[PDB]
């Protein structure tokens, strides 16, 4: 249980997070942590207080701490066309 909670009725997709590809399938030990798979890119973002070796990953309508050592921040810009 406790897999989400509805608040208000508003549609606004305004967020600026980072994206990285997983190098190996990780297994979260606790709730705070999230499970990661191999060859999968998720939304990573740093949160106040959080650690440097851990980012905020969002997968399966869930959020937790993800090990940067397992994530490879894909540093690549778009292709102006």
Swiss-Prot record:
Residues making up the signal peptide according to the UniProt record: none
Subcellular location as annotated: Cytoplasm; Golgi apparatus membrane; Mitochondrion outer membrane; Cytoplasmic vesicle, Autophagosome membrane
Tissue spec. comment: Isoform 1 is widely expressed. Isoform 2 is brain-specific. Isoform 3 is predominantly expressed in testis, but it is also detected in liver and, at much lower levels, in skin, stomach and ovary.
Domain SH3, residue spans: 15-75
Domain of life: Eukaryota
Family, as annotated: Belongs to the endophilin family.
Record remark on domains: An N-terminal amphipathic helix, the BAR domain and a second amphipathic helix inserted into helix 1 of the BAR domain (N-BAR domain) induce membrane curvature and bind curved membranes. The SH3 domain is required and sufficient for the interaction with UVRAG.
Note: Fibroblasts with a reduced level of Sh3glb1 show a defect in retrograde transport between the Golgi apparatus and the endoplasmic reticulum.
Self-association and partners: Homodimer, and heterodimer with SH3GLB2. Binds BAX; induction of apoptosis augments BAX binding. Binds DNM1, HTT, AMPH, BIN1 and ARFGAP1. Interacts with UVRAG; UVRAG bridges the interaction to BECN1 indicative for an association with the PI3K complex II (PI3KC3-C2). Isoform 3 interacts with PPP1CC; this interaction leads to the inhibition of phosphatase activity.
Its biological purpose: May be required for normal outer mitochondrial membrane dynamics. Required for coatomer-mediated retrograde transport in certain cells. May recruit other proteins to membranes with high curvature. May promote membrane fusion. Involved in activation of caspase-dependent apoptosis by promoting BAX/BAK1 activation. Isoform 1 acts proapoptotic in fibroblasts. Involved in caspase-independent apoptosis during nutrition starvation and involved in the regulation of autophagy. Activates lipid kinase activity of PIK3C3 during autophagy probably by associating with the PI3K complex II (PI3KC3-C2).
Protein name, UniProt field: Endophilin-B1
Gene: Sh3glb1
Residues of the full protein shown: 298 to 365 of 365
């Amino acid at each position: 249980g406790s897999s989400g909670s509805s608040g208000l009725n508003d549609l606004k997709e305004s967020s600026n997070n980072r994206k990285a590809r997983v190098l190996y399938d990780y297994d979260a030990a606790n709730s705070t942590e999230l499970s990661l798979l191999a060859d999968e890119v998720i939304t990573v973002f740093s949160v106040v207080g959080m650690d440097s070796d851990w980012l905020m990953g969002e997968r399966g309508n869930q959020k937790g701490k993800v090990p940067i050592t397992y994530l490879e921040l894909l540093n690549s810009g778009p292709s102006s066309g």
